[PDB]
Write a protein that holds these residues in place. Structure first.
Motif, PDB file in Angstrom:
ATOM      1  N   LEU A 157      69.314   1.493 -71.335  1.00  0.00           N
ATOM      2  CA  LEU A 157      68.532   0.873 -70.693  1.00  0.00           C
ATOM      3  C   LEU A 157      68.746  -0.854 -71.532  1.00  0.00           C
ATOM      4  N   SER A 158      69.536  -1.286 -70.357  1.00  0.00           N
ATOM      5  CA  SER A 158      69.160  -2.969 -70.923  1.00  0.00           C
ATOM      6  C   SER A 158      68.078  -3.578 -71.389  1.00  0.00           C
ATOM      7  N   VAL A 159      67.052  -2.837 -71.133  1.00  0.00           N
ATOM      8  CA  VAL A 159      65.269  -3.622 -72.262  1.00  0.00           C
ATOM      9  C   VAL A 159      65.032  -2.319 -72.898  1.00  0.00           C
ATOM     10  N   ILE A 160      64.912  -2.986 -74.892  1.00  0.00           N
ATOM     11  CA  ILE A 160      64.411  -2.063 -75.092  1.00  0.00           C
ATOM     12  C   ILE A 160      62.837  -2.734 -75.873  1.00  0.00           C
ATOM     13  N   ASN A 161      61.677  -1.963 -75.819  1.00  0.00           N
ATOM     14  CA  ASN A 161      60.118  -2.525 -76.472  1.00  0.00           C
ATOM     15  C   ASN A 161      60.370  -1.283 -77.394  1.00  0.00           C
TER      16      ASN A 161
END
Ligand SMILES: [Cl-]
Ligand SMILES: [Cl-]
Ligand SMILES: [Cl-]
Ligand SMILES: [Cl-]
Ligand code: NA
Ligand code: NA
Ligand code: NA
Ligand code: NA
Ligand code: NA
Ligand code: NA
Ligand code: NA
Ligand code: NA
Ligand code: NA
Ligand code: NA
Ligand code: NA
Ligand code: NA
Ligand code: NA
Ligand code: NA
Lengths: 124, 8, 124, 8
Positions: C65-69
């Motif tokens: 993953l390049s974006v983690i929320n």
């Protein structure tokens, strides 16, 4: 006026954990090759410690290389000693390796290590 | 101790 | 019996250089999102400091993953204080942020920070 | 000093 809280062991704990990641091959993103011998590492740690690696990974074309070959005349054990130093702060200088370590540190542009090698050569 | 105070 | 050479400022120099990479957006490989606010970082530094991030990036599916929320109820300034701590060893605890910082540190599984918050709450 | 010696 504010004061600050600092954690005495934080930076060395980070390095210890990064070295554990390296030992377990977790999130390693580059292999360095010296005379047919391979060393896995994290690009960001290399860049934080070596002027050569900082220059390589800030070059747009070289940024996404997954394998980097160094000059095959470099001593791979000298490289290994310096890679361990990067991840531990401990520099395994010995009478039988100091010249190889110094030459490798000059190539990698690790000026503090080079200064330290020159100190020990001058003392002996 | 694992903590210390220092100038801001 | 051998003795060892240790560089006093090496680990803190590495962290300083990693923080400079973060400031310049060099080799950052993840964006953390909290309540529509974004924070760029290096996965390996996050993993070295946070049990949550260590768990995420060792999961095969989540590794890339390049974006983690994060949970949107988390205070993004609490996250920012902890991210700065990861890269500097300095923890900006203040009367007006300590509860947010503690809750965020528990979520990120940063046990030493949590212990430190509990110490300051108990003293005051 | 930026260097020190410690046990192996
Ligand atoms: Cl991995
Ligand atoms: Cl150096
Ligand atoms: Cl970059
Ligand atoms: Cl912690
Ligand atoms: Na280690
Ligand atoms: Na590990
Ligand atoms: Na470039
Ligand atoms: Na280029
Ligand atoms: Na490649
Ligand atoms: Na060689
Ligand atoms: Na040796
Ligand atoms: Na810094
Ligand atoms: Na930089
Ligand atoms: Na897995
Ligand atoms: Na998985
Ligand atoms: Na993604
Ligand atoms: Na929130
Ligand atoms: Na604050």
């Amino acid at each position: 006026p504010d004061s600050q809280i600092q954690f005495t062991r934080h930076a060395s704990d980070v390095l210890l954990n990064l070295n554990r990641l390296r030992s377990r091959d977790i999130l390693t993103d580059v292999v360095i090759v010296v005379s047919r011998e391979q060393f896995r590492a994290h690009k960001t740690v290399l860049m934080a410690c070596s002027g050569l690696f900082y220059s390589i990974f800030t070059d747009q074309l070289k940024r996404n290389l997954s394998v980097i070959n160094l000059d095959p005349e470099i001593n791979p054990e000298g490289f290994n000693i310096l890679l361990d130093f990067m991840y531990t702060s401990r520099l395994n200088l010995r009478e039988g390796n100091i010249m190889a370590v110094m030459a490798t540190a000059m190539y990698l542009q690790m000026e503090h290590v080079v200064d330290t090698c020159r100190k020990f050569i001058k003392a002996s | 101790s694992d903590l210390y105070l220092r100038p801001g």
